[PDB]
Design a protein around this ligand. Structure first.
Ligand code: ADP
Ligand code: ADP
Lengths: 276, 274
């Protein structure tokens, strides 16, 4: 049958490792028809790599959503969304569409590493996106914010956060451990409301991992669209991103992206799956 | 070795078949590191499919170029560029970069007339003399050459000569549906020899993004080390498969399948000196 239509709602990462660029790249690697409704353009200073976020006007955001809704996505992913207004609209486009899958990557920006910048966006994601999400994909910080637990440091903490987030309406929860968990291996925790699954790969180099989160969530969405269950989709996504990470490369002294095409071009990576 | 970094200077096609979307998708298919400096956003009315083109401000355009230049592209493609100002800056950024390859897709909208011939003039002045490859369709080639309507391979040879002499190192004029409908003929010229490139003419219903995809593939193939002639032949094969495997999105548009070459099938290109 036809390619599945997969929409991301996200900003442009000019460096092209994260943002909508990671999304579209990943959708393409996974044999789906990628689409984007652009929210903002992120650029980087040539000397410091300091970010500058330029919002797109709401009129143009809405016109893009109108076109995408008309086309009719089979699955929708949200990336980093910067305002309450866009968060609310993203949930509404999903609800208006005939998409069967909604993957929410609840991206938050930090003022420390234990302090959120812009707590209002967290409340808006809880209010508008969690109750709609097929899969929500917080990192360890984000999971602590969504759950209200604060700092999480263990699989047991992640289980508690997943329970809470599920109870807030997300159908499936994957709490990424990854670098933030800082163990010998890379652990994530998947929950479906009944069983907790720990997903494990090797922990690869950490220097060039830009776009890992976006890519994981994008892969999850494409795998869902192509007919994997949420559990299978997150397992497959972890393999996909792990290869991308292993094969990350140095862009400059400030960043290096994952290699989105590594899973297909270079190597598959094994994922261990255990009940916890 | 490292992925080649390939930048497109292009707008967003919200429908995702053409524009920067086709470019990034094609770059990815061809095992390069795709990047975009966005010039504009094109949206379509849900009921009539009427297009609205929203230019992006020059300040955000410049911020993107600074980032992309810092990264350091190995190859740059230009897509549909809306203003003489942008056309000029695109050539400048190529020269400022260490990129070895510049692929200019001289996209025009036919309104033997364009909306603003000043854009054609700016392409001639600022882009053609920097281009490794320029990739006009039959209409665009008439405009760039000053010949108007082209009807034949012979006309295409004249237009290719004129465009080459305006300073493009290599010229491929796409005939496609405009020229004939039993086969899809293109004319490649390197200043020395004229080559006709041929595939079968495939379905014509769902061909959205074909031109962008062709120029994007040319760019990636040059970045990955194919000569200009081999790059354009490979690009024609790549897009031929994408066209053959095109599909209906809605009543208004049917995109090419950018991944068809690698996932579905290759298509051989017949090459003959003419
Ligand atoms: N260096 C690494 N090696 C292996 N897996 C990793 C690594 N970094 C992250 N991951 C995995 O990549 C995915 C994305 O992780 P995420 O936590 O979103 O990235 P970040 O560290 O930016 O927050 C998760 O599946 C996570 O386990
Ligand atoms: N229906 C078709 N069958 C086979 N090849 C085609 C078809 N339509 C276009 N082509 C080829 O696709 C490429 C892009 O052509 P074209 O669509 O003329 O560019 P443009 O969109 O800029 O008009 C060329 O190599 C052309 O020969």
């Amino acid at each position: 049958g036809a390619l599945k239509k997969v929409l991301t709602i996200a900003g442009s990462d000019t460096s092209a490792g994260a943002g909508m660029q990671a999304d579209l790249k990943t959708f393409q690697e996974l044999d789906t028809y990628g689409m984007v409704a652009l929210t903002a353009i992120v650029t980087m200073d040539k000397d410091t790599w300091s970010h500058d976020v330029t919002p797109l006007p709401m009129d143009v955001f809405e016109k893009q959503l109108e076109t995408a809704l008309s086309i009719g996505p089979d699955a929708i992913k949200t990336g980093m969304l910067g305002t309450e207004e866009i968060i609310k609209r993203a949930g509404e486009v999903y609800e208006a569409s005939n998409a069967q899958y909604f993957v929410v990557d609840p991206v938050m920006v930090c003022k420390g590493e234990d302090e959120v910048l812009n707590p209002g966006n967290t409340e808006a994601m809880i209010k508008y996106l969690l109750p709609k999400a097929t899969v929500v994909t917080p990192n360890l910080f984000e999971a602590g914010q969504l759950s209200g637990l604060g700092k999480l440091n263990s699989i047991e903490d992640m289980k508690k956060a997943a329970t809470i987030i599920f109870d807030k309406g997300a159908q499936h929860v994957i709490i990424k451990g990854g670098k933030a968990l800082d163990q010998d291996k890379s652990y994530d925790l998947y929950y479906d409301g009944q069983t907790f699954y720990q997903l494990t790969t090797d922990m690869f180099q950490q220097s060039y991992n830009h776009g890992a989160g976006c890519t994981f969530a994008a892969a999850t969405t494409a795998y869902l669209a192509n007919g994997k269950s949420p559990k299978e989709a997150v397992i497959s996504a972890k393999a996909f991103v792990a290869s991308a990470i292993k094969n990350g490369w140095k862009m400059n002294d400030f960043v290096g992206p994952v290699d989105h095409g590594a899973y297909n071009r270079i190597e598959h990576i094994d994922v261990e799956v255990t009940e916890v």
